[PDB]
Each structure stands twice: as structure tokens, then as C-alpha cells.
Design an enzyme around this catalytic site. Structure first.
Site, PDB file in Angstrom:
ATOM      1  N   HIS A 132     -16.702   4.091  -6.027  1.00 12.24           N
ATOM      2  CA  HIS A 132     -15.495   4.998  -5.961  1.00 12.24           C
ATOM      3  C   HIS A 132     -14.115   4.628  -6.546  1.00 12.24           C
ATOM      4  CE1 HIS A 132     -13.556   7.903  -3.209  1.00 12.24           C
ATOM      5  NE2 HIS A 132     -12.636   7.240  -3.217  1.00 12.24           N
ATOM      6  N   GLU A 133     -13.630   3.286  -6.448  1.00 11.06           N
ATOM      7  CA  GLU A 133     -12.521   2.900  -7.032  1.00 11.06           C
ATOM      8  C   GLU A 133     -12.387   2.986  -8.421  1.00 11.06           C
ATOM      9  OE1 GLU A 133     -10.011   2.767  -5.103  1.00 11.06           O
ATOM     10  OE2 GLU A 133     -11.311   3.089  -3.206  1.00 11.06           O
ATOM     11  N   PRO A 148      -5.802  -1.889   4.945  1.00 17.38           N
ATOM     12  CA  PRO A 148      -6.147  -0.913   5.827  1.00 17.38           C
ATOM     13  C   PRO A 148      -7.367   0.090   5.628  1.00 17.38           C
ATOM     14  CG  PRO A 148      -3.796  -0.808   4.954  1.00 17.38           C
ATOM     15  CD  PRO A 148      -4.450  -1.892   4.565  1.00 17.38           C
ATOM     16  N   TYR A 149      -7.634  -0.113   4.097  1.00 18.69           N
ATOM     17  CA  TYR A 149      -8.683   0.884   3.545  1.00 18.69           C
ATOM     18  C   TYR A 149      -9.780   0.065   3.002  1.00 18.69           C
ATOM     19  CZ  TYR A 149      -4.967   4.206   4.434  1.00 18.69           C
ATOM     20  OH  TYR A 149      -3.936   4.924   4.844  1.00 18.69           O
ATOM     21  N   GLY A 150     -10.842   0.919   2.711  1.00 19.97           N
ATOM     22  CA  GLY A 150     -11.764   0.188   1.900  1.00 19.97           C
ATOM     23  C   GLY A 150     -11.697  -0.378   0.460  1.00 19.97           C
ATOM     24  N   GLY A 151     -10.773   0.509  -0.246  1.00 20.96           N
ATOM     25  CA  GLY A 151     -10.281  -0.081  -1.385  1.00 20.96           C
ATOM     26  C   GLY A 151      -9.065   0.875  -1.815  1.00 20.96           C
ATOM     27  N   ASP A 171      -0.359  10.088   6.777  1.00 25.06           N
ATOM     28  CA  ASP A 171      -1.275   9.060   7.417  1.00 25.06           C
ATOM     29  C   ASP A 171      -1.996   9.640   8.765  1.00 25.06           C
ATOM     30  OD1 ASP A 171      -0.558   7.059   5.616  1.00 25.06           O
ATOM     31  OD2 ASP A 171       1.150   6.319   6.484  1.00 25.06           O
ATOM     32  N   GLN A 216       0.892  -1.081  -0.100  1.00 24.40           N
ATOM     33  CA  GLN A 216       0.025  -0.008   0.108  1.00 24.40           C
ATOM     34  C   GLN A 216       0.633   1.159  -0.068  1.00 24.40           C
ATOM     35  OE1 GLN A 216      -2.463   2.781  -0.493  1.00 24.40           O
ATOM     36  NE2 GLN A 216      -3.513   0.485  -0.286  1.00 24.40           N
ATOM     37  N   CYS A 217       0.954   1.982  -1.185  1.00 24.36           N
ATOM     38  CA  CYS A 217       2.096   2.886  -1.389  1.00 24.36           C
ATOM     39  C   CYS A 217       1.634   4.592  -1.021  1.00 24.36           C
ATOM     40  CB  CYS A 217       2.564   2.911  -2.615  1.00 24.36           C
ATOM     41  SG  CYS A 217       3.838   1.565  -2.973  1.00 24.36           S
ATOM     42  N   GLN A 218       0.257   4.532  -1.286  1.00 20.14           N
ATOM     43  CA  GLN A 218      -0.205   5.938  -0.921  1.00 20.14           C
ATOM     44  C   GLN A 218      -0.244   6.232   0.501  1.00 20.14           C
ATOM     45  OE1 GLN A 218      -4.574   6.873  -1.661  1.00 20.14           O
ATOM     46  NE2 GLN A 218      -3.827   8.350  -3.250  1.00 20.14           N
ATOM     47  N   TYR A 229     -12.474  14.246   1.498  1.00 18.30           N
ATOM     48  CA  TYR A 229     -13.707  13.524   0.620  1.00 18.30           C
ATOM     49  C   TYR A 229     -14.894  14.078   0.841  1.00 18.30           C
ATOM     50  CZ  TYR A 229     -10.675   9.247   1.012  1.00 18.30           C
ATOM     51  OH  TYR A 229      -9.839   8.200   1.025  1.00 18.30           O
ATOM     52  N   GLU A 255      -9.925  13.210  -4.099  1.00 19.09           N
ATOM     53  CA  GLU A 255     -11.157  12.534  -3.343  1.00 19.09           C
ATOM     54  C   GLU A 255     -12.465  13.258  -3.670  1.00 19.09           C
ATOM     55  OE1 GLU A 255     -10.867   9.475  -2.339  1.00 19.09           O
ATOM     56  OE2 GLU A 255      -8.436   9.401  -2.784  1.00 19.09           O
ATOM     57  N   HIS A 292     -11.966   6.776  -9.523  1.00 25.27           N
ATOM     58  CA  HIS A 292     -10.442   7.124  -9.668  1.00 25.27           C
ATOM     59  C   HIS A 292      -9.659   7.044 -10.911  1.00 25.27           C
ATOM     60  CE1 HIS A 292      -9.515   8.768  -5.563  1.00 25.27           C
ATOM     61  NE2 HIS A 292      -9.974   7.583  -4.978  1.00 25.27           N
ATOM     62  N   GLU A 312      -7.199   2.423  -5.563  1.00 26.96           N
ATOM     63  CA  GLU A 312      -7.414   2.463  -6.759  1.00 26.96           C
ATOM     64  C   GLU A 312      -6.244   2.129  -7.585  1.00 26.96           C
ATOM     65  OE1 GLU A 312      -6.433   6.925  -5.768  1.00 26.96           O
ATOM     66  OE2 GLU A 312      -7.393   5.132  -4.639  1.00 26.96           O
TER      67      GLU A 312
HETATM   68  O1  58Z Z   1      -9.949   6.829  -1.413  1.00 27.39           O
HETATM   69  C1  58Z Z   1      -9.812   5.582  -1.437  1.00 27.39           C
HETATM   70  O2  58Z Z   1      -9.834   5.128  -2.595  1.00 27.39           O
HETATM   71  C2  58Z Z   1      -9.287   4.669  -0.201  1.00 27.39           C
HETATM   72  C3  58Z Z   1      -8.858   5.406   1.067  1.00 27.39           C
HETATM   73  C4  58Z Z   1      -7.571   6.422   0.774  1.00 27.39           C
HETATM   74  N1  58Z Z   1      -6.661   5.548   0.195  1.00 27.39           N
HETATM   75  C5  58Z Z   1      -5.068   5.374   1.075  1.00 27.39           C
HETATM   76  C6  58Z Z   1      -5.100   6.669   1.977  1.00 27.39           C
HETATM   77  O3  58Z Z   1      -3.635   7.216   2.294  1.00 27.39           O
HETATM   78  C7  58Z Z   1      -3.483   8.682   1.983  1.00 27.39           C
HETATM   79  C8  58Z Z   1      -3.226   8.920   0.666  1.00 27.39           C
HETATM   80  C9  58Z Z   1      -3.210  10.315   0.354  1.00 27.39           C
HETATM   81  C10 58Z Z   1      -3.140  11.299   1.831  1.00 27.39           C
HETATM   82  N2  58Z Z   1      -3.099  12.668   2.013  1.00 27.39           N
HETATM   83  C11 58Z Z   1      -3.306  12.740   3.176  1.00 27.39           C
HETATM   84  C12 58Z Z   1      -3.507  11.797   3.848  1.00 27.39           C
HETATM   85  C13 58Z Z   1      -3.299  10.833   2.973  1.00 27.39           C
HETATM   86  C14 58Z Z   1      -3.552   9.262   2.998  1.00 27.39           C
HETATM   87  C15 58Z Z   1      -6.926   4.574  -0.808  1.00 27.39           C
HETATM   88  C16 58Z Z   1      -8.109   3.852  -0.566  1.00 27.39           C
HETATM   89 ZN    ZN Z   2     -10.500   7.616  -3.014  1.00 26.28          ZN
END
Ligand code: 58Z
Ligand code: ZN
Ligand code: YB
Length: 608
Positions: A293-294, A264-267, A373, A132-134, A381, A316, A297, A269
Site C-alpha cells: 500500500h505505502e 497512529p496508522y499502519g503506515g 481526523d 504526522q502531517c496528513q 479506501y 486511497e 502511494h 507514504e
Molecule cells: O493510507 C495510509 O497509507 C495510512 C492511513 C491514512 N494516513 C493518515 C490519515 O490522515 C488523514 C488524511 C487525509 C484525510 N482526509 C479525511 C480524513 C483524513 C485523514 C496515512 C497512513
Molecule cells: Zn493510503
């Protein structure tokens, strides 16, 4: 415009054009080992060095033109990791490209990665790895310019134990036995569309697939394939609507991967392969907005991308806006309004939790010295969506505003943009309505904390029954509790039941006797819908029902979607009777949790 989350050379200095990743997944050592070959284009005259992001990476060597070159790792900067400066052997002119090949190894504690033992999986026989890189964890996998302001194509060859399967955010490009090890397979991948590096993804495990549409396979462990195929059967119909709204789907395949419960997340993308939580498997397709949602994106985020994480709302907000349109197309405009109004409620919750003057309640945030994070919330969102829904209503309606959305995707495809780029295009597209645009309180909407200065107009049709029942309960005295019974719920959808609980949760605690009655007549304990169960358990715990303690502890730990795990732990910590148990359970599970989730729950609990 500076990406204050990255330590690498900025796009104005040099740009990664391509990554060729050749690595091997070592489950014994819990490391990824190999080479990342970066094709880098100088944006400057006489360029002699450059800097890359790294985090917990072991660097063996850097090779350019077939010879080893000098490099240096700076001092670690907390969550940003350590900058890696590389001395180029020959100065580069503007637009000159070279290939820089870096031999590296990851740490077992890579914040990008969760390594699962066989017992943490469904099948119980094989281990499992997922990334999970984001936002800024790609640096914890491989050295890169870890900023969404740079887009690159990629190819990869991944060597894994032969009984396991590798997948990536890319088109599958074949598999062969590993020529240098009979017990291993090499899987190949190609991503031909330039992407920011946060969209690089990798899974390795005992994976099986089933086709569910003309361009969609669902992948998961065998135990979950059948359920997932049914749960996500609306995928193709959603992709069709998405294409109508956003233009061509450019990524070829749209596959789904259902992760183990610690995801860690719902999805997420990831292009060509969306990752989703197994907590979506409600059995009735009721949580499919996450898929919408996914899918969305694929346009907003993956094609038009936020230039830095300060502008995350661009990703978002527009994605939620498209998400709600997909669901509105499928289920009606009254349903879109119901979801929009629910989202406003979630924004109220976020603002109340942070405080109405907190900087993380600003739409555009300043992430200097802030771990993304830690800053992550519903604000970008829902405040983002609220802005767009307000703008839709101001500028003449959904048909008109969708025209803008499609033109915006078209204009900024394959690019990375700021809030200013977005506002400038909004003014360009609606130049005949600039007088109306000038009535918007931009400074408040974009840069002030708290609830937005103006709330949109919401149809109330589906919400009324939820508010009415929630109010019955809130205003009930003991002698009213007898009037409630299972028939109260007979004309409510699962969505409405969830909203009833959300409405009631906002006024929590309720009297313990009320909550006991609610279980007695509605039997919410029997519902497996993760959203409904989550809100119900929070209601129970915040209302001091001891019986709910083991249920809340079990849900907090048997899955790890942060949306659910973080507030359940926090509620359990706030309840005197469960406080010690919450801390103990965290300490016990910490080592086998996702590293980011472990970190945030520890912070929430004031532990360590
Ligand atoms: O939005 C989505 O599709 C979900 C939720 C967010 N996701 C990972 C979140 O990680 C991040 C990315 C970017 C961010 N900028 C500030 C906080 C932050 C956290 C991916 C799946
Ligand atoms: Zn999203
Ligand atoms: Yb009474």
C-alpha cells in the site's frame, strides 16, 4: 475549487514553490525552533498580501528583502488553527517570485508531533520525536499553505543532540557538527520532487539502519532492526511490480522507518521514507500488504494528488487498487479476489457503524466545518476500491483497467486533481466504451451514502473455508461445541484465520460458552499477529468475556495504532464490567498518547 480545510491564500492567488527549513529540535522544551523560508510565486497582478496556515505556532518575525515586515495572526478557528496574513513590502506582478523568511517556534502540544520520553522507547536512554502531517497538521509544524493543491520542493537543515539521528521525507544530504554548538549535529535533506506539504516528515531518535534491497534501508531503534529487515524483505520485489504497473519510481530511495508503538496508522507514504507501525512485525511477513500500500502511494497520492481532502478517495481507492494487484502478482489472482472480498466486508462494517445515510459514507465528502481526523474511515479506501474493481469488471478486465491506471498516473503526475478530472480522463481513455460508462450510476457511486449501488463479482475459492467454519460456530448449540478442535484450522492461512474471525465478529456477540470453547480448542490467546489478535479480543469483549478485559486493555495501551486502539477502547467502554476501567486507563495514559489519538479516543469515550 476551494480547499475548505485551509485558511491560506489559494493556489489561484499565489503558490509556494520551495521551502528551505532550518530548525533545531529541543527535547528539553519539546519545541522545534527555526526559520521557514518560503519561495512564493504570485499568480496575480498587484499582489500586496497573502495568508498562511498556522496552528499553535509562536511567530517571532517575518523577513523579506532583509527587513522585517508587518503580519497578523487571526483568531483561532478550532482545528484549522490561526490564519497568518503577511503584508508584502512591494506589490508583486503575476509570476514574480519572492522569498519570505519566517522565524517561528512550535508548541509542545503541536498536533503534528509526538515527543517521547526515554522510557517510551525501546532503548530507554534517549528521547524520540516523530511527525504526522496528513491531513492538515503541517501548519502545526511551520507556516505554510496547508493544502494539497500546492506542490513544492524542499531543503532542510536540522540540528539535533549529537547522539541522535534526524531523518526526513527526502534524500539524506550529509551531516556535520553544529558550528554553533559542539553537543549537536546538523543533518541536511533535499526533496527535488514537488510534493504537497502533508508529505513533509521528520523523525529524531536513536536510529540504526540495515540494507534490505538495492534502494531500501530499514531504520528503527536497534532492538527492532533485525526483525524489521526480515519482516519487510519483500519490499524490492514489490517496488518492481509497482514500477511495472505505475511507471518509473521517481523518488530515488525507498527506505522504511519502523516507528515506536504509538504511531497512529499502519503506515504513512512519506516520500523516500515510508513510516510503518511496529504492529506489522508478525514474524511471518503476513501483514506486508501495508508495505504494498505505502509503495503504491509513490504513484497514487504522491505523484497524482487529491486537490482537496473532499477527494481523498482518489488517493486511497487507487492505492488500495494497486496494493491488491501487487499482492495478486505475488500470490495469485485468487488471493487478490480474497482480499477484495475482505475489503467489501470492512466497508459493510464502516457503513453499519456510521449508519447507511451518514454523510461520511459518501465517496466524495464535504469537509466544510468537519475536522478530517474525525471524518477519517475505511470508506474512501474500500468504497473507492469497490468502484475501481466494479469498473475493471465492466470495462473488460484487469489488464485493460491497469492500462488506464498507468495512463492516469502519467497524465496527472506532479499535479493535484478532483473527482471530475478523474471522471473526465476515464471517459477520455475509454471513449470507445462510453455507452458502458453511461450505464454507471455515477451520482450514487460518487455522492450517495451507504453501500454502493452494485457489488462487484468476487471469486470465492479462499473465502469458502472461512465462511464455512464461521457458520459452524454461529449455528452451533451447546451439544455441538465438542465437535470443534485444533484440526479445524490446519488448512487455513493466517489470512484465512483473520477472515474467519472477521466473519464471526460481524455476528457478535456469540454465547459466552462458545467463545470459551474457541479459546479452549484454538488458543487464539497465543497469537501475536496484531490483526488476528485485535479481532479475537473484540469478539471476546463484545461477547462479555471478563477474562479478556486485561488482554484488551493491554493491547489498547501498549500500542497506539488507531485502527486497533479506538475500537478496543470503544468495546471496553460498551461492556458494563470494563467501562470504568476503560475510562480510567484512558485518563491515565492520555498525557503520553499521540495528540490526535488522545483526541479521538476522548471523543469516542465521551470523556472531557
Ligand atoms: O493510507 C495510509 O497509507 C495510512 C492511513 C491514512 N494516513 C493518515 C490519515 O490522515 C488523514 C488524511 C487525509 C484525510 N482526509 C479525511 C480524513 C483524513 C485523514 C496515512 C497512513
Ligand atoms: Zn493510503
Ligand atoms: Yb443438538
Amino acid at each position: 475549487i476551494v480547499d475548505t480545510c485551509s485558511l491560506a491564500s489559494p493556489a489561484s492567488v499565489c503558490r509556494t514553490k520551495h521551502l528551505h527549513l532550518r530548525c533545531s529540535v529541543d527535547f528539553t522544551r519539546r519545541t522545534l525552533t527555526g526559520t521557514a523560508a518560503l519561495t512564493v510565486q504570485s499568480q496575480e497582478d498587484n499582489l500586496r498580501s497573502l495568508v498562511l496556515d498556522t496552528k499553535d505556532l509562536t511567530i517571532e518575525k517575518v523577513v523579506i528583502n532583509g527587513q522585517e515586515v508587518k503580519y497578523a495572526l487571526g483568531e483561532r478557528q478550532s482545528y484549522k488553527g490561526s490564519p497568518m496574513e503577511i503584508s508584502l513590502p512591494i506589490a508583486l506582478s503575476k509570476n514574480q517570485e519572492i522569498v519570505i523568511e519566517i522565524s517561528f517556534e512550535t508548541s509542545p502540544k503541536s498536533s503534528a508531533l509526538q515527543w517521547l520520553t526515554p522510557e517510551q522507547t525501546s532503548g530507554k536512554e534517549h528521547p524520540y520525536l516523530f511527525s504526522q502531517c496528513q491531513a492538515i497538521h503541517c501548519r502545526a509544524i511551520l507556516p505554510c499553505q496547508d493544502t494539497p493543491s500546492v506542490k513544492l520542493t524542499y531543503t532542510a537543515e536540522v540540528s539535533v543532540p549529537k547522539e541522535l539521528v534526524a531523518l526526513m521525507s527526502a534524500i539524506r544530504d550529509g551531516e556535520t557538527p553544529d558550528p554553533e554548538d559542539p553537543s549537536r549535529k546538523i543533518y541536511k535533506f533535499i526533496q527535488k520532487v514537488p510534493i504537497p506539504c502533508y508529505l513533509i516528515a521528520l523523525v529524531v531518535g536513536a536510529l540504526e539502519s540495515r540494507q534490505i534491497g538495492p534502494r531500501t534501508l530499514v531504520w528503527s531503534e536497534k532492538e527492532q532492526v533485525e526483525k524489521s529487515a526480515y519482516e519487510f524483505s519483500e519490499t524490492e520485489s514489490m517496488l518492481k511490480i509497482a514500477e511495472d504497473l505505475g511507471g518509473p519510481y521517481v523518488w530515488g530511495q525507498y527506505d522504511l522507518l519502523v516507528l515506536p508503538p504509538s504511531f497512529p496508522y499502519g503506515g504513512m507514504e512519506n516520500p523516500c521514507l515510508t513510516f510503518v507501525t511496529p504492529t506489522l512485525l508478525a514474524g511471518d511477513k503476513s501483514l506486508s500488504n501495508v508495505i504494498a500500500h505505502e509503495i503504491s502511494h509513490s504513484w497514487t497520492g504522491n505523484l497524482v494528488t487529491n486537490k482537496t481532502w473532499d477527494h481523498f478517495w482518489l488517493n486511497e481507492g487507487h492505492t488500495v487498487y494497486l496494493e491488491r494487484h501487487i499482492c495478486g502478482r505475488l500470490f495469485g489472482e485468487k488471493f487478490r479476489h480474497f482480499n477484495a472480498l475482505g475489503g467489501w466486508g470492512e466497508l459493510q462494517n464502516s457503513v453499519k457503524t456510521f449508519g447507511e445515510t451518514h454523510p461520511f459514507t459518501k465517496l466524495v465528502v464535504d469537509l466544510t466545518d468537519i475536522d478530517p481526523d474525525v471524518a477519517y474511515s475505511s470508506v474512501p479506501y474500500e468504497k473507492g476500491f469497490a468502484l475501481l474493481f466494479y469498473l475493471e469488471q465492466l470495462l473488460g478486465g484487469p489488464e485493460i483497467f491497469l492500462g488506464f491506471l498507468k495512463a492516469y498516473v502519467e497524465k496527472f503526475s506532479y499535479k493535484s486533481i478532483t473527482t471530475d478530472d478523474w471522471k473526465d480522463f476515464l471517459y477520455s481513455y475509454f471513449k470507445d466504451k462510453v455507452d458502458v460508462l453511461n450505464q454507471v450510476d455515477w451520482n450514487a457511486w460518487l455522492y450517495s451514502p451507504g453501500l454502493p449501488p452494485i457489488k462487484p463479482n468476487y471469486d470465492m475459492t479462499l473465502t469458502n473455508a472461512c465462511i464455512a467454519l464461521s457458520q459452524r460456530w454461529i449455528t452451533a448449540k451447546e451439544d455441538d461445541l465438542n465437535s470443534f478442535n485444533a484440526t479445524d484450522l490446519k488448512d487455513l492461512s493466517s489470512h484465512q484465520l483473520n477472515e474467519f474471525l472477521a466473519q464471526t465478529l460481524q455476528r457478535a456477540p456469540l454465547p459466552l460458552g462458545h467463545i470459551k470453547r474457541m479459546q479452549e480448542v484454538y488458543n487464539f490467546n497465543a497469537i501475536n499477529n496484531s490483526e488476528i489478535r485485535f479481532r479475537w479480543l473484540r469478539l471476546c469483549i463484545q461477547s462479555k468475556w471478563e477474562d479478556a478485559i486485561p488482554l484488551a486493555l493491554k493491547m489498547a495501551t501498549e500500542q497506539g495504532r488507531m485502527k486497533f486502539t479506538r475500537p478496543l477502547f470503544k468495546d471496553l467502554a460498551a461492556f458494563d464490567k470494563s467501562h470504568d476501567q476503560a475510562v480510567r486507563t484512558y485518563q491515565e495514559h492520555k498525557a503520553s498518547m499521540h495528540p490526535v489519538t488522545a483526541m479521538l479516543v476522548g471523543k469516542d469515550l465521551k470523556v472531557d
